[PDB]
Structure 1
């Protein structure tokens, strides 16, 4: 991910758990953990969460393996709220990227 194409900036699509702390965890996990992912622009595969959750196997990394250990509290909850959002928006930006390829076409 020395390059990649930062998978847009979704500003958090609001994933809302209707929680106090785990919600908030995600709501801060929009900053500590981002609302954008690390991947290059795709529209040449079938599976989404494959390439997508992989882009987060990049993103959540950079954002939880140093970006979190900078004084954040990441628990199993953080993993999900973060991977889940960052993944499903990498997925959102997968279908977006797909059609973005249609726009650049």
Structure 2
């Protein structure tokens, strides 16, 4: 499940762009419902970034939907699409941090 998975520190949500004015407004209007921190395994346990990121995204999104729906929530396909895009950026950033602290 979450064995060997650390919880990274809070970080500012990535300002992603959707030129369609609506999704941009939907992202801004709903980001409070999305994660602001991620779950990851020590960076040394991965060969590259793609592996770290792919693993970090799946675990972060899943933990988030089960723990928040327990309290009462609803994640559409839009919500899921936006979340994966957002969490991916945060994971790449979490990767840099782990790689910087050697």
After TM superposition, the score normalised by the length of structure 2 is: 0.73
Cα shift readout 1:31-52 (whole Å, capped 9, x = no counterpart): 3221211113314533323222
Q: Equivalences for 1:39-58 in 2 at 5 Å?
A: 39-58=40-59
CA distance in 2, matches of 1:61, 1:28: 22
- Which one has a larger percent helix, Structure 1 or Structure 2? 2
TM-fit CA distance, 1:70: 4.4
Structure 1 residue runs without a partner (length 5+): none
2:14–2:89 contact (8 Å) kept in structure 1: no
1:11–1:30 contact (8 Å) kept in structure 2: no
Bigger shift: residues 71-80 or 58-67: 71-80
1:66 is paired with a residue whose SS is: helix
1:69 to 1:26, Cα distance in 2 relative to 1, 3 A: farther
1:35–1:85 contact (8 Å) kept in structure 2: no
Structure 2 residue runs without a partner (length 5+): none
1:37–1:90 contact (8 Å) kept in structure 2: yes
- Number of positions where the alignment pairs a residue of Structure 1 with one of Structure 2: 101
